[PDB]
């Protein structure tokens, strides 16, 4: 019953890695705010770039989350 | 004596303006750092 | 490139059978100074030179040793 | 960690004090920059 | 720079030492291989 | 085994570390000539540039240390540069020498700030426009910061040089171990080793400069 | 005692007697710390 | 100087005093410095040779540690 | 600091080369009147 | 006393011409070279030179040194020479 314990602790460790995606999404949307305040006539393209950056950062975060779930359930 | 056989002491003798002010500046480099 | 062989073909070549007498000449010469003890009249300049030549032929012996064991760094076994 | 062995510590302190505080400074004192001629 | 012909004694010494070294290397190789393999096996 | 390069060297039983520590000044020849060789010319140009870099920010009392601080940066740098040569023992990898360099100089600055300057010395522990309810904590912080400054100096120099040398030795071990394996990977590991060698040269110079600059700032805050 | 005090101590006297006094106090403190470190070892 | 002398009494006639050996090392340093460094249009070799010797010294006291990493046995 | 200021130019030269370039790209229906309205005539003495 | 204009004619930055000229009469031109190669082979053949990580760190630092010298040697030499020529010109201007 040590594999179960290790799966719990390793899944917690694995899901630690979502902090990076959180901070990266914060950075992407803060820079969206700044770049829209400077050039409010590029709103659509700036939002497109923000969507792309958020998608990639959350992709890394979800990679961490799915490694966690793989350890926790799929071994 | 040509300047390639010359010592700093020989220059302080030939041009007394080049001598360092060891009394106004007692410590190395014996001059203002901007002068350097 | 090719200058190395141009120099080697004069002194870095095996001794021809014609000068093996000349060789032993010098050899006896040396032991002749070892016969009497006159080697002390050799100033340390040529003494050092002869020591360097002897170290060189010893390095020749050791390169022969490494070609006789088919391995550079020590004995592979 | 050989840096933690305090037995060889004076051997590291004593020459440095002679090198940093005496010899390097005696060589810098002989590095002089005269004033420019007129 | 023109080369210098080496004295025949130094040349004969060079090559005699080279050949004696070849012989010595082969001899000591064949001498050490059995004992070497022996303690290699005995260590395990 | 791995830290064998940081053990006090001995030749035939004698402390060769003494010779290794006394050697760096031998590389700085001096002359009374007005015009002299290329080595002394380049070295005097370097010493003048270094003196102007380190000493211009100081007042007349701090500039009296021009001989000291310069002698510091000339002594460390070469000692670090001579440490990159093969098989060399680097005394700046020793916490001993670095502590003996850091504690005397920092202590001298703080003591010359507490002998004179004492009003302003005690005022320095509090920033000028610090709000009132926060004055206590900013005195507990600045005090232990000042008390750790010398250990920070010594440990920065020691750890940086030792870690650089360890990383270079480990990449060399990797190159040697993978020489009998893939040659492309061996040459890319050797290229990493070359980049690391250039980085280590830069780091030797930078660590000398930063040790001297921190000592210079401690002196500036007490003159 | 000649050359040493002539070529070593006369040049370094202005620094050893007036400039490095606090450095001398700090070296005393450093030696004390080193003694107490080697004592607990 | 030696390289011409051919007597063992020379070995004992020299000045093996502290000041004597000091003068010997100083004369050697000045011979090297005058031959290789103290010239106009000088070369970096006058430095590198020194460095070479340094490395040789650095290999001498490191041999005790290195001989434990030999790759053969004899 | 732009590349032309590092080269020693001024903003009065930047505008001249930028206004001249804008004038050169005008369709010739406006080009003559534009280069006549904005052309310089003062001489330096 | 003025300074000589050249040093001691070192080869490869390690060996002076004096050694080659001193070994030339007895063993010719390739005498010193084969002596050096034989010494190297005897050293790394009887484990006088142990091959380790330090071998490759040495190769790296030696390559970097040789490259730096070949690349910044003319520049450093000309820099020192122009410093000395500027000083000489200023002094003879003041004369």
């Amino acid at each position: 019953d040590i594999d179960t314990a290790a799966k719990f602790i390793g899944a917690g460790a694995a899901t630690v890695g979502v902090a990076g995606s959180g901070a990266g999404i914060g950075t992407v949307f803060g820079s969206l705010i700044i770049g829209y305040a400077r050039n409010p006539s590029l709103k659509q393209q700036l939002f497109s770039y923000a969507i792309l950056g958020f998608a990639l950062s959350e992709a890394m975060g979800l990679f961490c989350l799915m490694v966690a779930f793989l350890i926790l359930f799929a071994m | 004596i040509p300047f390639d056989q010359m010592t700093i002491e020989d220059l302080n003798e030939a041009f007394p303006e080049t001598k360092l002010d060891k009394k106004k500046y007692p410590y190395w480099p014996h001059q203002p750092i901007e002068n350097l | 490139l090719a200058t190395f062989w141009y120099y080697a073909k004069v002194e870095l070549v095996p001794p021809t059978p014609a000068e093996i007498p000349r060789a032993i000449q010098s050899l006896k010469k040396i032991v002749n100074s070892a016969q009497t003890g006159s080697f002390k009249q050799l100033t340390v300049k040529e003494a050092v030179l002869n020591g360097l030549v002897a170290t060189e032929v010893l390095m020749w012996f050791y390169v022969g040793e490494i070609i006789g064991k088919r391995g550079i760094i020590g004995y592979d076994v | 960690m050989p840096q933690l062995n305090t037995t060889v510590w004076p051997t590291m302190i004593t020459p440095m004090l002679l090198t940093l505080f005496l010899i390097t400074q005696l060589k810098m004192l002989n590095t002089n920059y005269h004033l420019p001629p007129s | 720079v023109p080369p210098v012909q080496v004295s025949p004694l130094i040349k004969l010494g060079r090559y005699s030492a080279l050949f004696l070294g070849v012989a010595y290397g082969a001899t000591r190789y064949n001498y050490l291989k059995p004992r070497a393999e022996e303690e290699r096996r005995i260590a395990a | 085994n791995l830290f064998a390069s940081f053990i006090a060297p001995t030749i035939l039983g004698l402390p060769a570390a003494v010779l290794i520590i006394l050697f760096p000044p031998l590389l700085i020849p001096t002359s009374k000539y007005l015009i002299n060789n290329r080595l002394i010319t380049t070295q005097q140009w370097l010493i003048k540039l270094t003196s102007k870099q380190m000493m211009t920010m100081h007042n007349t009392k701090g500039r009296t240390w021009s001989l000291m601080l310069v002698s510091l940066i000339i002594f460390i740098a070469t000692t670090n540069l001579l440490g990159l040569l093969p098989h060399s023992f680097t005394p700046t990898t020793q916490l001993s020498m670095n502590l003996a360099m850091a504690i005397p100089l920092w202590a001298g600055t703080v003591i010359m700030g507490f002998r004179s300057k004492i009003k302003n010395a005690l005022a320095h522990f509090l920033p000028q426009g610090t709000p009132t309810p926060l004055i206590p904590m900013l005195v507990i912080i600045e005090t232990i910061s000042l008390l750790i400054q010398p250990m920070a100096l010594a440990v920065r120099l020691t750890a940086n040089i030792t870690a650089g040398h360890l990383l270079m030795h480990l990449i060399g071990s990797a190159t040697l171990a993978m020489s009998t394996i893939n040659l492309p990977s061996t040459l890319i590991i050797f290229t990493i080793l070359i980049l690391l060698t250039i980085l280590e040269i830069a780091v030797a110079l930078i660590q000398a400069y930063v040790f001297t600059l921190l000592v210079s700032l401690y002196l500036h805050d007490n003159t | 005692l000649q050359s040493i005090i002539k070529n070593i101590w006369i040049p370094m006297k202005p620094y050893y007697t007036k400039v490095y006094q606090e450095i001398w106090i700090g070296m005393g403190l450093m030696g004390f710390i080193v003694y107490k470190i080697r004592a607990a070892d | 100087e030696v390289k011409l002398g051919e007597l063992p009494s020379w070995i004992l006639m020299r000045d093996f005093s502290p000041s004597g050996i000091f003068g010997a090392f100083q004369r050697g340093y000045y011979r090297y410095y005058n031959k290789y460094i103290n010239v106009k249009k000088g070369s970096i070799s006058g430095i590198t040779m020194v460095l070479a010797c340094y490395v040789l010294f650095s290999y001498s006291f490191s041999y005790k540690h290195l001989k434990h990493e030999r790759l053969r046995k004899y | 600091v732009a590349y032309w200021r590092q080269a020693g130019l001024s903003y009065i030269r930047y505008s001249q080369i930028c206004a001249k370039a804008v004038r050169d790209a005008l369709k010739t229906e406006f080009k003559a009147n534009a280069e006549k309205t904005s052309g310089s005539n003062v001489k330096i003495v | 006393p003025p300074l000589p204009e050249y040093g001691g004619k070192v080869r490869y930055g390690l060996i002076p011409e004096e050694f080659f000229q001193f070994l030339y009469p007895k063993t010719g031109v390739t005498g010193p070279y084969v002596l050096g190669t034989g010494l190297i082979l005897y050293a790394l053949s009887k484990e006088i030179y142990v091959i380790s990580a330090e071998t490759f760190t040495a190769l790296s630092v030696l390559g970097v040194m040789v490259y730096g010298i070949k690349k910044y040697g003319p520049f450093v030499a000309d820099f020192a020479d122009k410093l000395n020529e500027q000083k000489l010109a200023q002094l003879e201007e003041a004369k």
Binding site: - | - | - | - | - | - | - | - | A2, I12, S15, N41, I44 | -
Partner: protein
């Protein structure tokens, strides 16, 4: 007639160029030394008291400045003002300009004057420009406009509210404003 038709957009332009210094309230340095005085006139005579007004104002302020210790350098746009002021004020003179009046002034003229006032090596601390402000067909009055330096607009405390500003943008802005004030003076003096 044509000059008065061209003076309306030129006046809007030149007065919009000066709105910054009126809203930021730049006050000029009463301490600095070097001064640059520009006088706008034409190359043609028979104009009445145009050039004489410019010359009187120029020499009056030159006296008033040199009595305060300032070293004043003169610029004369138009041959008439240089001719009138050359004999008695030549020691204080930097550059003059010809071919003013035959063809109506353009912005290229102001740009050229601004270049040869910038490519002069005369690092002035403050300047004034003296022109004939047009009031009506009957009346005109000789006016003065100040010309600030980079250090005057950078060291001003009222300029701390202008964001995204460094010395480079202020240099470019002051150069363009020199050109603008010269253009406005030329368009006011031709009418």
């Amino acid at each position: 007639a044509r000059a008065e038709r061209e003076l309306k957009p030129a006046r809007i332009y030149g007065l919009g160029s000066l709105a910054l210094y009126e809203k930021a309230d730049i006050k000029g340095p009463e301490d600095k030394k070097k001064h640059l005085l520009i006088g706008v006139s034409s190359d043609r005579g028979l104009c009445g008291a145009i050039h004489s007004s410019i010359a009187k104002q120029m020499k009056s302020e030159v006296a008033t400045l040199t009595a305060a210790g300032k070293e004043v350098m003169l610029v004369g746009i138009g041959d008439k003002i240089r001719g009138i002021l050359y004999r008695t004020h030549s020691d204080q003179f930097l550059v003059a300009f010809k071919e003013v009046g035959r063809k109506p002034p353009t912005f290229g003229d102001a740009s050229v004057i601004a270049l040869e006032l910038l490519n002069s090596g005369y690092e002035f601390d403050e300047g004034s420009i003296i022109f004939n402000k047009f009031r009506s067909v009957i009346s005109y009055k000789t006016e003065e406009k100040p010309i600030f330096s980079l250090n005057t607009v950078a060291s001003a405390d009222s300029m701390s509210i202008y964001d995204d500003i460094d010395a480079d943008v202020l240099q470019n802005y002051q150069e363009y404003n020199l050109a603008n004030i010269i253009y406005y003076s030329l368009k006011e003096s031709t009418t």
